[PDB]
């Protein structure tokens, strides 16, 4: 009954055997070691305990299992992490995010306008994937005419930061970083010359304790915002909508009562957990929930496993938009708790509301399909999602 798994193999997260493996871990070895000896916290309690002990469970070795740390806030410990976060968080105040509703809602209606006359689309390719990229592109000063070029960068940049870059990909990947770097430094220079109220303008002016973000830091932190908030948000939108359609009583409940939308978004986040893991590196030997851990090794925090922990969530394989409490760990916990969580929730809220209203009879093309998942060991979710609906006229 024990799973024979490599937690650094993206195929594990795409196999649809992962939650069965998680169940074995939570029941039998809550701090699990995989077939290569990699440690992983599988229970909600173990994930929370590690998050609450950043001096023992550090981010400064990097958040990926077999990669060096990068000079960005997520690979830093406090108090230096706080300064970097304080500087960047000026772009993500509650007002600034709330003020994005008008533009985000307009993006949602434009995306739905593009497919509403067809009566079919791919929910991932045509709705869930374009929205987070357009939202982040808008904040970074990407013209809609530059969205094609910017979109190729964003896909190739995921490969750049991934665990293995093939010989055949090395060129396009370093070319994507260079292109992103050059583009971003141009935007930075433009806002230092002529400030506006976009994200880069806010970041170039941000000052904490007489310290500002350097140009190097601005490229790194905007890159973290782009990669961190693009595919993740996409996967919650698609996988959450998949669950509304597979449990159509939940779709009907939400369609009938807009006040259920916040709870629905939280259940979509709990269920989809697009960030499958973040690593911590041990700063000392320790005994952790029955497993001996050694100084210098990394442990994965399995957020999806935690989100299906029966110790915290009653009937966790039931998708329930009215679930309360719903203290899921899709955004993590503690000092690195997702900086983009309010923006992600707003994108998800606005798009889901518009889909339920404008594609009211949305359905999966084939409910017996096992839809394909991205075989990546870090962020994963649906690769495609064919849907059908009654055509309607665009709002234009
Ligand atoms: C549904 C979408 C999202 C998910 C599931 C998600 C998930 C996460 C997770 C799990 C972490 C690490 C927390 C931890 O280790 O405890 C994180 C950190 C972060 N996320 Fe997100 N995220 C999402 C959307 C976004 C967006 C839209 C942004 C854009 C600003 C963003 C920017 C960040 C940043 C900058 C960090 C690093 C925070 C820090 O180190 O202090 N994320 N996110």
Q: How far apart are CA 73 and CA 218, in angstroms?
A: 11
Contacts of 10 (CB under 8 A, 6+ apart): 374, 375, 376, 377, 380
Q: Considering Cα of 110, then 116, then 122, then 128, what sign does the dihedral take? A: positive
CA 153 to chain centre: 18
For ligand 1, whether the C-beta of 32 sits within 6 Å is no
Residue nearest to atom 1 of ligand 1 (CA): 233
63 C-alpha to ligand 1 centroid (Å): 12
Ligand 1 mutation pick, 59, 104, 132, 228, max ligand atoms within 8 A of CB: 228
Name the pairing type of β-strands 120-122 and 286-288.
Answer: unpaired
For ligand 1, whether the C-beta of 306 sits within 6 Å is no
Contacts of 90 (CB under 8 A, 6+ apart): 202, 203, 205, 206
341 C-alpha to ligand 1 centroid (Å): 7
Q: Give the CA radius of gyration of the chain.
A: 21
Contacts of 325 (CB under 8 A, 6+ apart): none
Q: How far apart are CA 130 and CA 58, in angstroms?
A: 34
Which atom of ligand 1 is nearest the CA belonging to 224? 35
Residue 145 CB: number of other CB atoms within 10 A?
Answer: 8
What separation in angstroms does the CA of 154 have from each of 53, 57, 97, 321, 325?
33, 30, 22, 32, 35
If phi > 0 it is left, if psi is from -120 to 50 it is alpha, else beta; for residue 387 that is: beta
Q: How far apart are CA 337 and CA 332, in angstroms?
A: 5
Contact in structure between 121 and 387 (CB atoms under 8 Å) = yes
Residues across the chain: 396
The torsion angle over the Cα atoms of residues 153, 155, 156 and 159, rounded to 10 degrees, is 150
User: Resolution reached, in Å?
Assistant: 1.5
Q: What is the 3-state secondary structure (H, E, C) of the chain?
A: CCCCCCCCCHHHHHCCCHHHHHHHHHHHCCEEECCCCCEEECCHHHHHHHHCCCCCEECCCCCCCCCCCCCCHHHCCCCHHHHHHHHHHHHHCHHHHHCCHHHHHHHHHHHHHHHCCCCEEEHHHHHHCHHHHHHHHHHCCCCHHHHHHHHHHHHHHHHHCCCCCCCCCHHHHHHHHHHHHHHHHHHHHHHHHCCCCCHHHHHHHCEECCEECCHHHHHHHHHHHHHHHCHHHHHHHHHHHHHHHHCHHHHHHHHHCHHHHHHHHHHHHHHHCCECEEEEEECCCEEECCEEECCCCEEEEEHHHHHCCCCCCCCCCCCCCCCCCCCCCCCCCHHHCCCCHHHHHHHHHHHHHHHHHHCCCCEECCCCCCCCECCCCCECCECCCEEECCCCCCCC
For ligand 1, whether the C-beta of 224 sits within 6 Å is yes
Number of domains in the chain: 1
For ligand 1, whether the C-beta of 57 sits within 6 Å is no
Which atom of ligand 1 is nearest the CA belonging to 236? 1
Name the pairing type of β-strands 277-282 and 298-302.
Answer: antiparallel
Ligand 1 mutation pick, 79, 338, 342, max ligand atoms within 8 A of CB: 338
Name the pairing type of β-strands 120-122 and 57-58.
Answer: unpaired
What separation in angstroms does the CA of 217 have from each of 74, 84, 147?
12, 9, 24
What's the token pair of residue 33? 């070691």
Which atom of ligand 1 is nearest the CA belonging to 73? 40
Q: How far apart are CA 39 and CA 32, in angstroms?
A: 6
Cis-peptide, bond into residue 215, ω within 30° of zero: no
What separation in angstroms does the CA of 292 have from each of 4, 142, 231, 305, 313?
20, 48, 35, 21, 27
369 C-alpha to ligand 1 centroid (Å): 30
Contact in structure between 180 and 157 (CB atoms under 8 Å) = yes
Ligand 1 mutation pick, 231, 340, 347, 381, max ligand atoms within 8 A of CB: 340
Residue with structure tokens 């503690």? 334
Contact in structure between 192 and 218 (CB atoms under 8 Å) = no
For ligand 1, whether the C-beta of 346 sits within 6 Å is no
Q: How far apart are CA 161 and CA 164, in angstroms?
A: 8
What's the token pair of residue 203? 């970041």
Contact in structure between 282 and 293 (CB atoms under 8 Å) = yes
Contact in structure between 122 and 386 (CB atoms under 8 Å) = yes
Residue with structure tokens 């940049």? 157
361 C-alpha to ligand 1 centroid (Å): 32
For ligand 1, whether the C-beta of 228 sits within 6 Å is yes
| Beta bridge partner(s), residue 282 | 57
For ligand 1, whether the C-beta of 270 sits within 6 Å is no
Residue nearest to atom 14 of ligand 1 (CA): 332
Burial, 351: exposed, middle or buried (Cβ in 10 Å; 0-12, 13-18, 19+)? buried
For ligand 1, whether the C-beta of 131 sits within 6 Å is no
Expressed as residue numbers, the domain containing 161 is: 1-396
């Amino acid at each position: 009954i024990k799973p024979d798994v490599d937690l650094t193999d993206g195929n594990f997260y795409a196999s649809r055997q992962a939650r069965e493996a998680y169940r074995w871990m939570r029941a039998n070895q809550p701090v699990f070691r995989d077939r290569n000896g990699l440690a992983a916290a599988s229970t909600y309690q173990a994930v929370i305990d590690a998050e609450r002990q950043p001096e023992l469970f550090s981010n400064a070795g990097g958040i990926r299992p077999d990669q060096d740390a990068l000079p960005m806030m997520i690979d830093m410990d406090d108090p230096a992490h706080l300064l970097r976060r304080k500087l960047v968080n000026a772009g993500f105040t509650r007002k600034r995010v709330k003020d994005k509703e008008r533009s985000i809602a307009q993006l949602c209606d434009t995306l739905i306008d593009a497919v509403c006359e067809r009566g079919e689309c791919d929910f991932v390719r045509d709705l869930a994937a374009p929205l987070p990229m357009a939202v982040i592109g808008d904040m970074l000063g990407v013209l809609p005419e530059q969205r094609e070029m910017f979109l190729r960068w964003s896909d190739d940049l995921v490969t750049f930061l991934s665990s293995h870059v093939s010989q055949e990909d090395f060129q396009v990947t370093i070319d994507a970083f260079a292109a992103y770097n050059d583009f971003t430094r141009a935007t930075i220079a433009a806002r230092r010359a002529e400030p506006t109220d976009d994200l880069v303008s806010v970041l170039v002016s941000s000052e904490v304790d007489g310290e500002r973000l350097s140009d190097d830091e601005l490229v790194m932190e905007t890159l973290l915002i782009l990669i961190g908030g693009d595919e993740t948000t996409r996967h919650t939108l698609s996988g959450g909508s998949e669950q509304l359609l597979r449990n159509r009583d939940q779709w009907d409940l939400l369609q009938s009562d807009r006040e259920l939308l916040p709870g629905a978004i939280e259940e979509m986040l709990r269920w989809t957990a697009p960030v499958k893991n973040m690593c911590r590196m041990l700063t000392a030997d320790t005994e952790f929930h029955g497993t001996a851990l050694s100084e210098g090794e990394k442990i994965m925090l399995l957020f999806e496993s935690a989100n299906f922990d029966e110790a915290v969530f009653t009937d966790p394989e039931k998708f329930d938009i009215q679930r309360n409490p719903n203290s899921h760990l899709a955004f993590g916990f503690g000092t690195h708790f997702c900086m983009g969580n309010q923006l992600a929730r707003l994108e998800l809220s606005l798009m889901t509301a518009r889909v339920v209203q404008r594609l009211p009879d949305l359905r999966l093309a084939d409910q017996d399909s096992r839809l394909p998942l991205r075989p990546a060991n870090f962020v994963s979710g649906l690769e495609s999602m064919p849907v059908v609906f009654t055509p309607s006229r665009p709002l234009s």
